[PDB]
Amino acid sequence: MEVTVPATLNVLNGSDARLPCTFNSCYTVNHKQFSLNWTYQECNNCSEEMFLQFRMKIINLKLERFQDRVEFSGNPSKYDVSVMLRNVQPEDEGIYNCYIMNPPDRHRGHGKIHLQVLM
Amino acid sequence: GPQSFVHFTKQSLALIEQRIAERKSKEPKPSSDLEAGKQLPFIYGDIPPGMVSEPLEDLDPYYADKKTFIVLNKGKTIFRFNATPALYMLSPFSPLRRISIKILVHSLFSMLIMCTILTNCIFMTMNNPPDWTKNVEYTFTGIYTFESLVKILARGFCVGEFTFLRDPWNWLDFVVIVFAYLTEFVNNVSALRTFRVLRALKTISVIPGLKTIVGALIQSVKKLSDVMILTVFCLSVFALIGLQLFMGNLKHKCFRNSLENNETLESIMNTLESEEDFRKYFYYLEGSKDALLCGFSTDSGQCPEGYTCVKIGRNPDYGYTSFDTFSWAFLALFRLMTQDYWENLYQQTLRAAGKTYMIFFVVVIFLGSFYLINLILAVVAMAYEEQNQANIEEAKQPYWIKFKKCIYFIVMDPFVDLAITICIVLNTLFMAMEHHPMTEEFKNVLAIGNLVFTGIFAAEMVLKLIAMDPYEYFQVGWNIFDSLIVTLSLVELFLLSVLRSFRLLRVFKLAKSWPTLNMLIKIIGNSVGALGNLTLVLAIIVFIFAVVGMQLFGKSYKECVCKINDDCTLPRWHMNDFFHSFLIVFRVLCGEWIETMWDCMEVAGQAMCLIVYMMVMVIGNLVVLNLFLALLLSSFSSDNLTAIEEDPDANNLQIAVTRIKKGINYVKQTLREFILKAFGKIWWNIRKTCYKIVEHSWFESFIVLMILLSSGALAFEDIYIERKKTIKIILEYADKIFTYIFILEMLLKWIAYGYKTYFTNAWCWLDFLIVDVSLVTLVANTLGYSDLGPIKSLRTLRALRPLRALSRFEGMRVVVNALIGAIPSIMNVLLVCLIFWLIFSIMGVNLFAGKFYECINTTDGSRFPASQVPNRSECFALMNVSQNVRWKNLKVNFDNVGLGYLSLLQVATFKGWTIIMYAAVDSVNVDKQPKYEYSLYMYIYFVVFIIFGSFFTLNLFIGVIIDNFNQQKKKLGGQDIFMTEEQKKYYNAMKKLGSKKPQKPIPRPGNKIQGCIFDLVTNQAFDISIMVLICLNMVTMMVEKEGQSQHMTEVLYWINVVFIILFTGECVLKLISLRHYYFTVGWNIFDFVVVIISIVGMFLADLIETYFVSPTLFRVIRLARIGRILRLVKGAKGIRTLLFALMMSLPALFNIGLLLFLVMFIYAIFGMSNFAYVKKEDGINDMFNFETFGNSMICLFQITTSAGWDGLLAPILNSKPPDCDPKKVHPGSSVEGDCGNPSVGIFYFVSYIIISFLVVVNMYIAVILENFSVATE
Amino acid sequence: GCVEVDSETEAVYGMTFKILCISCKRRSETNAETFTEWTFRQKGTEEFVKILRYENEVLQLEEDERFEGRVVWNGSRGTKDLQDLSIFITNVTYNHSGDYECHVYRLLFFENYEHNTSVVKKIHIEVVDKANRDMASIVSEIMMYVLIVVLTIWLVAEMIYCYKKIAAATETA
């Protein structure tokens, strides 16, 4: 299971950030079986906050720290699971993690993005 | 003259300059014996010390006008260089140039390059390499670039002739180096790694002798153009026929009758994705990946009750087995022609369409699958014989001496060799007495016997080494061989199974006194002797293909593994690593390429897998067939040169038997001497009239008709005869009348001929035996003993009644005479095969005796994982708890030598070998549960056996049989041995059609418009236009597919009608132009017939699809369109000759097929008699069994090609519970039990496949070969 | 395997008789649970009357004077997947002549599917006092004998004619 994510993503304050998380699993993405776990952590050792997931439909938990600024921007049927984010605040700087499981695959992938807010 | 060795100097350059000036003012052939890469002519003698590896004058006077020079190498080889400065910068008189020339000409340079390439080919065989191999690949790139640099410095890059780029292999070297540097700096990784395999092809360049072999192979492949064109055309025609007949038929499935929630077939099919979901709506057999196929006809497959047949879903085998499109039909027809897993397609098509469609498969198998392969073999054979003839023509153009002498007297006596040969035979027979359930005392006696035998051989070795010194002992290859065997035996005694089987090679010492067993040694030695380069090229090609397949598809096989295996584990055959890639390539060469190609496609794409597999098939089979034919022709032709007299120094065995017979004569004479000292005119007319009646055509015809009727009455005794009581009674009384008729005929022949004339005749003996069996059966039935054991068993011999037609039919009697003549050589080669296979059988017993047992779940047939139930004791402990557990064994295994023979036969024929190989590689030990691929490298045993037995043993078999046929033909006086005297006249008249000169041209008519049309129609432009129109019509017929729109169907119909109009118009033009001269040409009247058939077929199909409902009749009638595309033969001279060869070989093939049909009929009757009630397992199912004459003939035609005979024999090997039920009750019959007879089944199937091999392969090859030479002549 | 043989149609008075009813499945590898019921319409009557039922290896005879103590099971034994559903009359009388029906109730067990089907087989039984010979057997024997005699007569005629011709030619020579 191969997951392609940028190690560092630098965006300007007040701009929109698209978090590129992609994979190349051999089997077709069965929406009845696909599992997504998007988590955010302020640091590598910090705990992860569960905020976005796919079980059967894109479900956004709408955390207070993200408000209504988090939506889905990829497509599982074409192997893009990217997450968009409007008007990136300086507080949005941190580490974003995408975890993907795509049955009947056995290996479980993990993509990590460090989002940086520029002045 | 040796003074011509002058150095290349400035005066030489000035002379070349003045000569080029004269050449410019001027505004032949170079010497072949002086050409570069060869040795100097012997006239030049030895090289003086001062001129080796130095610029010399061009020794060829041809190049006296050009700036070219010669550098001579130690070892007497000549390299032709260029005197033009390299790169326009470095003159030939330069230190760099001289050093580079010396380096290039040195042999250590070539040795280093060969070692480098062979080392890199080892690192190529790593699926994932360690991180430190980057340094090694950098070292390899550095060595390669240094070699290329020294070549460029020595001979210039691309400046004039004799430069670096002028050699085609230097192109490959340059491409390799640029690819390496590009992938190192600029950077698909898999494609670059697959390009790294190109560094293996440099073995051809650096190893001497391989370049010529590759060139010869390419020249041979240039000779197959006509055969390839004909093969493609025939496959296209058969694919179009199959597309017309079976389009969409493999999408039939059994669908549920009762549906809930208002759901319909479309609604269900729009939601299902998984096989578990499909299994709830379609009927699947247990442990199957595809839904059961059904049919709408009476003879097709039957759905269960509550299921109905419908055309929906996907085709079987991942969707790859179908006739839905021309491409898939072409793939299926290529598979049929190569006969690779063709029985599965046979059974699938029969189940889906009907059993009357076996005619298509009969025609295909006996017209393409055999004739095209034999044509390919014949053409390659002639290419090799022309190459060999050209090669031959060019070649033509104090106290110790007492003991020494005493032991020389003792051990060199001829009787000693006879005693040693007897000991060898006894030791082999003693080793062949090993089985799995062997008691301790038997093991002890075997060990003691083997110890005694190795002691005897060692004592003989010591006696022979003290009789003469080692300097004379070690001078003979036989003594070296025996020395190796004895020392290995001693090593094993001091210390395995393998070393125990090593002593078995001593059986080859009988080759001295066995002329036929020496042929096997000659073939094997040639394979690594004269043809060692061909074998090496084959090995290099196989290595390259294995590496390429691994590099391309190994990662895919591991990522997409759940697409091809339910457990998400790698299958048995994959390409994830080098050994399994090589196994796949070797299996393809064996001839199994479709089952692995399906998984290849599933994981890594149709285009890539198809390209790679087709390349492997074509190139590997070309090289393997070339090696096979080279071995055959070399060993059976070049060995016949009368080198040495027949045993000039008589062998010790011959001297021993001569002394033995002399002593026998002496003893007989002495004993005879000792015992003698101690002590009516009307009867002749009766015989004459009996002879007149018997020898009459009316009598012969009546008896032949009776034979046919009595033979045909045997086919009605199905298992369904209890429903036909009138037919039963009629057939009983018919049996009585037939017995009376034949008894009367035999009495008449007795009185007509005389007892001596009758009984010195094999045909009369056969008739007498058959009528005696019939009379005994009739008498026993009359006396009431109709069920007395052996008397009841004697009734199955009624299947031999058809054997009375061999003497009646001249074509069958003609073929049987050839078989009888060839019998002795068949026995010889069969004995050699048995002796050779005994070694492998004993080795297989020693390796796998008793290790094929396993503990299975009977419900699923799945082996328990060895973590639980690791041995048979735990298997029994689990059986005491569960109820569906069993400690099972393979039915065909290596438990003794007898069963090892059957295992070896199944492996050598490639039918059922995979089960044995899986068991062998899983085997752990005795009373131990097998583990998956625990003994992985047991595949090497089967690879080595397949090579040595199946390839060399088949080479020997074919060589001996064709030699016997040639000797028979020479004995007859150059007369065809497969044709009757009446057929010879037809053949002679028919042979004259290939040499008639063109007749006078048709005169122009009188009418002006008629003459103008004549000039229009007699034109090459007209002929070419007609040919391209035929090609376009063929394309429009190829375009048509399954599920096409009604619009496309209508436009295709209109296009075809337009083509019909065009061809009819051209026929009318030719008719009105040529008047009545048109019908004087066979091709012209063939075109006329085709035009009429096309018009009639179109009208009839339109009628049958409008005023009638009959899709099958419509499909069959629509086959008349193939006539419009069969006309491409007219303008194709290359394939017309091959078709004429086929037409020339038809009369003998007819007789061969007649005999084959008689044998198949007899075997079918025997099969219905014996195996009609065996359990439905493996290859015996509801549709392919021995319950009916039609079913039996279908199965027998299937196994005539040796396909699925393992799967048909497997249900018959059951003889005891819980495999079978001896007291099973069959409703509607009095027969009890569903068990088989293992001995009868083994004899039946082995004998049938041997007969099929001896007829349908060997006579087919001989007939096709001779008639292809004739058609070619 | 299973072959659907039809029953005989003539039973002799005072002896034993077996009434055949074989019903095979379309596919022999499928599982089923089968039971049967036999009805009987005596000649001279118009109504079919149930006489027995067999299920789960127990035969249940209805209270019928004509068949009490005369019918035993003669079909497939030891299983619930009945394919031979024959009965056996141990003492034939004149009350056993009429039309019989063999109702077969088969319940196939498929994957997530059960099919409850039914078959009916009709057997007409006529009782006699003496067992008649088969017309097919009679005509077959007659034709075999006439064929034997015709062939022998033809051969003897040809032998006599050829012998006389050969003797005449020889004595002329």
Ligand SMILES: CC(C)CCC[C@@H](C)[C@H]1CC[C@H]2[C@@H]3CC=C4C[C@@H](OC(=O)CCC(=O)O)CC[C@]4(C)[C@H]3CC[C@]12C
């Ligand atoms: C040269 C070729 C033609 C073979 C010549 C004969 C012998 C070299 C071999 C071939 C087959 C062998 C036989 C094959 C099988 C058996 C059965 C085996 O006994 C069993 O089957 C034991 C089974 C049990 O104990 O349960 C004893 C050896 C024997 C007779 C073998 C004895 C030696 C034979 C005759």
Ligand SMILES: CC(C)CCC[C@@H](C)[C@H]1CC[C@H]2[C@@H]3CC=C4C[C@@H](OC(=O)CCC(=O)O)CC[C@]4(C)[C@H]3CC[C@]12C
């Ligand atoms: C030329 C003649 C004399 C022999 C022709 C056959 C050989 C190619 C065979 C016979 C013995 C075989 C060997 C016998 C034993 C083994 C051990 C086997 O491994 C095991 O048994 C399991 C080891 C483990 O995992 O612990 C792997 C194959 C190998 C090397 C075999 C390789 C192939 C051999 C050499």
Ligand SMILES: Nc1nnc(-c2cccc(Cl)c2Cl)c(N)n1
């Ligand atoms: N090596 C090998 N040799 N011969 C055969 C063979 C056997 C019987 C019939 C046929 Cl037609 C073949 Cl080709 C085979 N299946 N495999």
Ligand SMILES: *[C@@H]1O[C@H](CO)[C@@H](O)[C@H](O)[C@H]1NC(C)=O
């Ligand atoms: C078909 O649909 C109707 C409602 O439209 C429903 O009442 C009915 O139960 C359905 N059919 C069955 C037999 O389930």
Ligand SMILES: *[C@@H]1O[C@H](CO)[C@@H](O)[C@H](O)[C@H]1NC(C)=O
């Ligand atoms: C086998 O099973 C029976 C019944 O459960 C049990 O009584 C007996 O002890 C078992 N015997 C062995 C040898 O396991």
Ligand SMILES: *[C@@H]1O[C@H](CO)[C@@H](O)[C@H](O)[C@H]1NC(C)=O
């Ligand atoms: C049938 O029953 C009658 C009356 O009981 C008896 O006379 C006759 O012998 C019986 N037949 C048989 C076959 O027992």
